[PDB]
Amino acid sequence: SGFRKMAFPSGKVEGCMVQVTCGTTTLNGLWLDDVVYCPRHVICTSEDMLNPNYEDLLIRKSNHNFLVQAGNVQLRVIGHSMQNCVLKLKVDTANPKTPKYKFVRIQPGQTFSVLACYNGSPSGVYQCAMRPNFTIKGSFLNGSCGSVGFNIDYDCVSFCYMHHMELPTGVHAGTDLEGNFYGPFVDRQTAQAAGTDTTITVNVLAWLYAAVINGDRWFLNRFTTTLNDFNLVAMKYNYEPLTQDHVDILGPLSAQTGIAVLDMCASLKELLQNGMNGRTILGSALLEDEFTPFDVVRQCSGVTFQ
């Protein structure tokens, strides 16, 4: 037993991280088959970033201006192209460590593991969630751009995130691996509004089922509620509206535990209206929303990969 914020094993992704240098800028790239993917702002100077014309800036660059280093190994760049906000550098060597992979665009409220990297070398791994406002709350220093987020299905790595920027707040923004930003953000250094975030209600309920499964329980009340009634409480507290689809998704956890979803919402309702009284749940004094229902099923099922 026990319940932890758990990241996927990162070995399959470590084998794909490379270093990309263009002039003065060095960041991380993702090497799959004979293509290296990286943020297109690798071609910007410190001045270019306030208002870059990426097409015009890219035209000044040739294949030999992109230095791609894999460990100490040295890739020859033989073509380059921009796709949305990512550059694709064609190299003359296919990555022998390429895992079975896919590119996916995840939905807000979903989770994924981040392999934070500097100079092409992995530094650490952590889990998080795509916020309803399409930011993530990560740990990214200077040089971390091009670090990727991902999920693993047994053998197959689904890449879903590439890091591009930090906002004047400490939250982070980036793209899918086709280069389309999550959310309204653009890759220039100008003020950018994330907008109101909300709490992922279906994830909080899944965590409450995780808590019940691990013996923590004081919160299980006595009450029940309705979907429309609970949703009134959700809006007062900036929670995402709970749908029937969310109820169906929680159907494995409701049946393993024997607790109806709307009963659990009545518990959550009282949590939101009364606080925690200085108690804790699964070792937290806050309501946790970065575990999906599938994260919980996985966690207490022992699903492995590789």
Next chain:
Amino acid sequence: SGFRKMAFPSGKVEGCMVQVTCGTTTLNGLWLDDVVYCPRHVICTSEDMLNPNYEDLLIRKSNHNFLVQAGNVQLRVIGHSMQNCVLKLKVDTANPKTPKYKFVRIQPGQTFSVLACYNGSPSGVYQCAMRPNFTIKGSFLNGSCGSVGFNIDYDCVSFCYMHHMELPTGVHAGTDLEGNFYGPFVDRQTAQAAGTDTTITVNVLAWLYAAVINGDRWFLNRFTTTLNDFNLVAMKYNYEPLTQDHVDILGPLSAQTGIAVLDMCASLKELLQNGMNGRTILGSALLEDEFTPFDVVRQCSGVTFQ
């Protein structure tokens, strides 16, 4: 910026995980050079575990009774031996994926990454701390025994923990890689007292420096205190006594931030006497103690490995 509970990249350890089967019992082993390490209770039946005589039970076993499977690959066992609470199975093939490694016995309050595994296959990775009472608070289901904890120094993996058991509480106990339990625990299924845990004061202070570095600050007060005065407050609140050694260890963080350690203790004192008023620090409503001072320096330094 940002600050996250971050695990080491696990690729070097993934390459060492194997499956060990003895009769009915299957668990994980750690394959380094031509030796596989695993918990010795792999030789126990469900009945043996209430009161095992490990020497007598081991005598009934021969090399061919240990089935070691590496992925699908098949290792020949050519010797076996007990060292404290671990078995060492000599195999006829050295692991080609063996990293530079060391076996270390960590101190309470230190941290390490756990690669949780089932049937020899990695499932997830998370960070934690050796509690002052020599337990860990992990996520371990049936079959997870033999999963290992570790730290990485650039190239070198320092293995420090192997999982053996859960206690009737949801906390976890295990050994170093020489088979000596952390804490007073034994490998039999009988009631076992963990004893009072305490909070790792030097780790909480490091986290408060992490918070200050990341803009979170409302807690920085006005007061100062003395080492003896603060230590009076530590005991009332089950905190480990702060030593001068702890003060010296916090010397990088005090100088980066410009805040004297005893000033930070005065802040922590007021936190302990007044609560959080429903505020949060680095996204937590509790005082976090599973980051070491070096975890913080690393985290906001961008140190990489491999």
